[PDB]
Amino acid sequence: DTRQARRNRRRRWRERQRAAAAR
RNA sequence: GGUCUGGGCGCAGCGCAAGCUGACGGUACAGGCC
């Protein structure tokens, strides 16, 4: 995986854990 | 209403050289199934 692919894939886990954390 | 993918090009940090990276840009953009 490239920096973007991971970065892109990460922001999903990122924001998602974001939602859970926030919620 | 939900879910999945990804290429930069940027600012920074380091080296006889050769290279790489930031739960950062970027909750972007570009495209997906009912």
Q: Is the CB of A2 under 7 A from strand B?
A: yes
Q: Is the CB of A23 under 7 A from strand B?
A: no
Q: What is the DSSP string of chain A?
A: --HHHHHHHHHHHHHHHHHHHH-
Q: Is the CB of A3 under 7 A from strand B?
A: yes
Q: Is the CB of A1 under 7 A from strand B?
A: yes
Measured distance CA(A7)–CA(A17) in Å, rounded = 15
Strand B nucleotides, any atom under 7 Å from protein beta carbons: they are 3-9, 20-28
Measured distance CA(A21)–CA(A14) in Å, rounded = 10
